[PDB]
């Protein structure tokens, strides 16, 4: 199983049941801000600042309400549609349990404890105030929770895990408050909504020449969904600290003949998140530019804080909140009480969020087999069920100790462990070659 850190308290202290009655505190009907008459949805608070909505995401993007698969002629190769998935209470219960178990698997590693700790500390900056003597929240970093008396209270949060939209296997991140400010790239950060399903996973090939070839392999090995959730959490970490890289900054891939011949491009933000050898394809000149840019945004935040002399609202005091951001951005404070950004500390924080928290490093912690590069081609999608401990555990994922699955990644081998995988679609050969 994974490289452990030793006994620790669970990341999720409640074992939620989807049908548990609402209590208006950590099981509650909620509404996202600026949603007009949206019907409330039942949501579950799994940890401070992190909530789960076990519903398909028909609510975040106005462009994405229909779960119905488009016309067969219309659908891309790597996609999968099922308008009924996550429609029933039992599925929702399973979803909650599956997401819970993957957070616990992540938090059982030191790397996962570090990332989840950064995520909880990464409170979206209070950049809301029209005037600078006052520090105000940005209310799109909050949700509206129905209390037991039927009234709404607003609650700040950092992360919401929600079910996918129409394409089940597209795990996008939506966030709010960026119609003018690019909150995920200006140091501020914003609450992230990650579309994710612990009920499906992807097949990959164990040979590099086959996995990076769009015509070969059927997806013999299944990706551990804890790696996939970690990958989304790393993106969310960059976005909560406001240092995600504009997706228009791309590597025009020329290290893989098949990518090149199709003119496929991959964002720097993906190479960064993958890590390993992939991050080296980020142009160093551009990377150095990015660091300087984010460093300056952090200096803007320190200046903003410095001007604030009163807080708005009654959740927390001005001193509490100045300290929350001093912590978050690791600001220095002078004899006079002025905050500044220390270059050394900035370099440490940026490196932690962008080099230490990477997919490739998570693979090392989990001791799982995984794609060796992001520059590969997906092979297949599988239906799985990680909830029963006979199928998947916090410590071992699929590669269960004291079974024939413990060695050689047998548990991820979808031919040996075939009871744990139902292949839903082949992608190989549907590629545009
Ligand atoms: Li279904
Ligand atoms: Li186990
Ligand atoms: Li199967
Ligand atoms: Zn990604």
């Amino acid at each position: 199983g994974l490289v452990p850190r030793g006994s620790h308290m669970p990341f999720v202290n409640k074992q939620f049941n989807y049908k548990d009655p609402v209590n208006g505190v950590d099981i509650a009907y909620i509404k996202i801000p600026n949603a007009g008459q949206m019907q409330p949805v039942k949501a579950f608070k799994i940890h401070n600042k992190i909530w789960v909505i076990p519903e398909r995401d028909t609510f975040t993007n106005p462009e994405e309400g229909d779960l119905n698969p488009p016309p067969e002629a219309k659908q891309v190769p790597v996609s999968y549609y099922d308008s009924t998935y996550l429609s029933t209470d039992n599925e929702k219960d399973n979803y909650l349990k599956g997401v819970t178990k993957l957070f616990e698997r992540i938090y059982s590693t030191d790397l996962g404890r570090m990332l989840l700790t950064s995520i909880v500390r990464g409170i979206p900056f209070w950049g809301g105030s029209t005037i600078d003597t006052e520090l105000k929240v940005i209310d799109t970093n909050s949700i509206n929770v129905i209390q037991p008396d039927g009234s709404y209270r607003s609650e700040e949060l950092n992360l919401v895990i929600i079910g996918p939209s129409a394409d089940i296997i597209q795990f996008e991140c939506k966030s709010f408050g960026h119609e003018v400010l690019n909150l995920t790239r200006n140091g501020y950060g914003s609450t992230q909504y990650i579309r994710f399903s612990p009920d499906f996973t992807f097949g990959f090939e164990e040979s590099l020449e086959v996995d990076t070839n769009p015509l070969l392999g059927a997806g013999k090995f299944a990706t551990d969904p804890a790696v996939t959730l970690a990958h989304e959490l790393i993106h969310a970490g960059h976005r909560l600290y406001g240092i995600a890289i504009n997706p228009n900054r791309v590597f025009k891939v020329n290290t893989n003949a098949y990518y090149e011949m199709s003119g496929l491009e991959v964002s720097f933000e993906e190479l960064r998140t993958f890590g390993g050898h992939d991050a080296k394809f980020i142009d160093s000149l551009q990377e150095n530019e990015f660091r300087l840019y984010y460093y300056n945004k952090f200096k803007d935040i320190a200046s903003t804080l410095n001007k604030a002399k009163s807080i708005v609202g009654t959740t927390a005091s001005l001193q509490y909140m100045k300290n929350v951001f001093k912590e978050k951005y690791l600001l220095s404070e002078d004899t006079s009480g002025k905050f500044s950004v220390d270059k050394l500390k900035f370099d440490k924080l940026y490196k932690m969020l962008t080099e230490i928290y990477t997919e490739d490093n998570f693979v090392k912690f989990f001791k799982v087999l995984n794609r060796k590069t992001y520059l590969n081609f997906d092979k297949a999608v599988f239906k799985i069920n990680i909830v029963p401990k006979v199928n998947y555990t916090i410590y071992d994922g699929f590669n269960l100790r004291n079974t024939n699955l413990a060695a050689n990644f047998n548990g991820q081998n979808t031919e040996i462990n075939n009871m744990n995988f139902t292949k839903l679609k082949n992608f190989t050969g549907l590629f545009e070659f």
Side-chain angles (χ1 to χ4, degrees):
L2 50 82
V3 192
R5 52 174 182 109
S7 108
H8 59 271
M9 273 285 281
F11 187 73
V12 189
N13 273 77
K14 273 186 190 164
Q15 298 198 49
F16 288 110
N17 296 297
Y18 179 73
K19 294 208 199 240
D20 288 336
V22 277
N23 61 34
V25 179
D26 55 347
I27 300 171
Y29 292 104
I30 77 170
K31 281 187 100 314
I32 59 161
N34 302 327
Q37 279 188 352
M38 152 194 179
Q39 278 298 101
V41 290
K42 192 173 186 183
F44 299 70
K45 188 178 201 178
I46 62 160
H47 188 96
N48 179 27
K49 309 304 200 262
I50 302 169
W51 289 68
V52 178
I53 303 173
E55 293 287 339
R56 298 288 296 279
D57 178 12
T58 59
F59 54 90
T60 68
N61 181 3
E63 255 32 279
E64 305 179 80
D66 181 34
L67 296 175
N68 279 303
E72 269 210 18
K74 188 59 176 309
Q75 310 180 15
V76 312
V78 175
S79 57
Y80 173 76
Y81 295 89
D82 167 21
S83 62
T84 75
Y85 161 63
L86 207 52
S87 68
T88 64
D89 284 0
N90 194 45
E91 290 180 274
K92 297 175 175 170
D93 193 65
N94 221 52
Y95 184 94
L96 234 33
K97 295 167 165 66
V99 175
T100 294
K101 174 169 327 185
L102 291 180
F103 276 89
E104 289 305 344
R105 175 158 171 67
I106 295 174
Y107 193 65
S108 294
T109 68
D110 272 307
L111 188 57
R113 168 194 75 65
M114 297 162 57
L115 169 56
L116 280 178
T117 296
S118 294
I119 286 166
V120 175
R121 297 187 175 152
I123 306 307
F125 182 63
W126 282 36
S129 171
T130 72
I131 45 136
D132 63 49
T133 42
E134 292 180 343
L135 206 65
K136 195 173 176 180
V137 77
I138 291 177
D139 53 8
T140 44
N141 294 324
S142 308
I143 55 165
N144 288 317
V145 186
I146 290 182
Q147 321 175 282
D149 74 340
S151 71
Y152 286 93
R153 59 163 177 95
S154 160
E155 177 160 331
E156 284 176 67
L157 69 189
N158 291 2
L159 176 68
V160 185
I161 306 306
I162 191 176
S165 195
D167 179 354
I168 281 162
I169 61 187
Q170 186 181 71
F171 292 167
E172 292 209 325
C173 239
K174 323 299 278 202
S175 67
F176 301 107
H178 64 93
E179 297 180 308
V180 187
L181 270 15
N182 283 320
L183 292 181
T184 62
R185 320 204 272 262
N186 76 350
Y188 277 28
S190 57
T191 299
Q192 299 296 315
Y193 292 66
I194 303 176
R195 289 170 181 174
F196 175 75
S197 170
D199 299 308
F200 298 86
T201 196
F202 305 82
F204 72 95
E205 293 290 319
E206 61 283 8
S207 286
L208 189 63
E209 321 161 292
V210 171
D211 199 44
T212 60
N213 194 292
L215 311 171
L216 296 170
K220 175 170 164 165
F221 285 91
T223 292
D224 191 320
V227 172
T228 304
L229 174 59
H231 182 110
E232 303 308 347
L233 285 175
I234 289 167
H235 278 311
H238 300 155
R239 291 159 97 84
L240 284 164
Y241 282 77
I243 64 177
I245 295 171
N246 195 321
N248 85 354
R249 310 300 274 261
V250 305
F251 171 49
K252 272 151 204 315
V253 174
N254 66 3
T255 49
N256 172 304
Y258 309 98
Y259 269 62
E260 277 205 275
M261 90 186 45
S262 274
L264 300 184
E265 287 174 329
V266 174
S267 79
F268 289 164
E269 172 73 9
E270 303 287 352
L271 304 177
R272 166 206 265 184
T273 291
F274 189 81
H277 171 58
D278 283 15
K280 283 189 266 193
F281 298 122
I282 282 156
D283 181 40
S284 43
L285 263 20
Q286 301 193 232
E287 173 66 46
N288 278 326
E289 165 206 346
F290 301 157
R291 302 168 175 216
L292 176 57
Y293 180 88
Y294 303 121
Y295 171 74
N296 286 322
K297 295 289 174 179
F298 273 27
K299 288 198 319 183
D300 302 335
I301 289 172
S303 287
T304 294
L305 294 160
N306 284 345
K307 322 210 153 15
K309 16 131 157 290
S310 66
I311 198 140
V312 189
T314 55
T315 327
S317 72
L318 179 66
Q319 326 78 237
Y320 192 86
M321 287 316 302
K322 288 195 168 191
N323 189 67
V324 154
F325 295 117
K326 185 185 173 169
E327 282 166 321
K328 166 181 186 192
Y329 298 102
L330 305 168
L331 305 182
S332 286
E333 168 163 35
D334 73 14
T335 62
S336 142
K338 165 182 228 41
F339 289 147
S340 54
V341 180
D342 168 76
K343 282 196 191 153
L344 267 197
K345 286 187 294 174
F346 171 80
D347 285 354
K348 286 173 74 144
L349 180 47
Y350 182 88
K351 183 182 158 163
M352 185 67 49
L353 288 168
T354 72
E355 296 176 25
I356 298 301
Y357 308 159
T358 65
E359 183 172 326
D360 200 61
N361 286 335
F362 269 100
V363 170
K364 296 183 213 296
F365 282 76
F366 287 137
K367 310 276 264 332
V368 287
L369 189 67
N370 188 83
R371 67 185 174 190
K372 299 292 197 254
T373 181
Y374 199 77
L375 304 183
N376 69 347
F377 290 84
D378 296 305
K379 311 300 182 185
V381 52
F382 292 101
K383 189 71 184 62
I384 62 183
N385 180 8
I386 70 169
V387 176
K389 298 192 215 172
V390 288
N391 291 355
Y392 182 106
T393 61
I394 285 163
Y395 271 88
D396 294 336
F398 292 112
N399 292 324
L400 307 168
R401 63 189 74 195
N402 300 168
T403 73
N404 62 332
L405 308 175
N408 300 315
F409 314 112
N410 285 350
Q412 296 175 258
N413 178 324
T414 66
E415 299 161 18
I416 299 178
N417 191 13
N418 62 279
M419 296 275 72
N420 269 294
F421 305 95
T422 297
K423 181 187 300 198
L424 308 171
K425 196 167 172 201
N426 276 304
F427 310 133
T428 301
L430 262 36
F431 288 103
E432 341 101 311
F433 309 84

